[PDB]
């Protein structure tokens, strides 16, 4: 299986809950208090041509399931076509736009050797594996997580949030 020679290898990690995160407000996250809650992490961006319909939908998602156990985890990322140039500040306005109440992190990498930890792991879970690459490939990629902080399911680029839908009840 997995072997690492650091204790703290995200290669060796087993959930998502081992990883933390820094929020968009710039303070540090422990993802283990997302045990016992279904999550989808996304990466987003604010000048993609699919920023309104994942914004709005995630937003729509959360606020109507969040009381089942519903959690969102929204990472900013610049690496796609440079759509999401702003800082932190800026961009946590933007979604204050659309009455984001779920959790925003700060803008990171999620390919090449600086990618967060947590993506890196994320890749290369057998649900998450990507395509001659396992590497992001475009905006508002999603993931799910189960309650165990294990992800069981990805959806692409295109995929526009309500797709997961029909897929939470089977995690609530």
């Given at each position: 299986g997995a072997m690492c020679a650091?204790?703290?290898?995200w290669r060796c990690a087993?959930?998502?809950?081992?990883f933390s995160a820094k929020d968009i407000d710039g303070h540090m996250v422990n993802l283990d208090k997302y045990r016992g809650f279904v999550c989808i992490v996304t990466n987003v961006a604010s000048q993609c041509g699919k920023t309104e319909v994942n914004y709005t939908q995630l937003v729509d998602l959360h606020a109507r399931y969040a009381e089942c156990g519903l959690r969102i985890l929204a990472f900013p990322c610049n690496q796609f076509g440079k759509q999401e140039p702003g800082s932190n500040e800026e961009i946590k306005e933007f979604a204050a736009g659309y009455n984001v109440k779920f959790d925003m992190f700060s803008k990171i990498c999620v390919n090449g050797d600086d990618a967060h930890p947590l993506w890196k792991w994320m890749k290369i879970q057998p649900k998450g594996k990507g395509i001659?690459?396992?590497?992001?490939?475009?905006?508002?990629t999603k993931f799910l997580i189960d309650k165990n902080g294990c992800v069981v399911k990805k959806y692409g680029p295109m995929e526009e949030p309500l797709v997961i839908e029909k897929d939470l009840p089977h995690y609530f």
């Open positions: 650091s204790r703290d290898d087993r959930s998502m809950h081992e001659l690459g396992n590497a992001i490939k475009w905006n508002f």
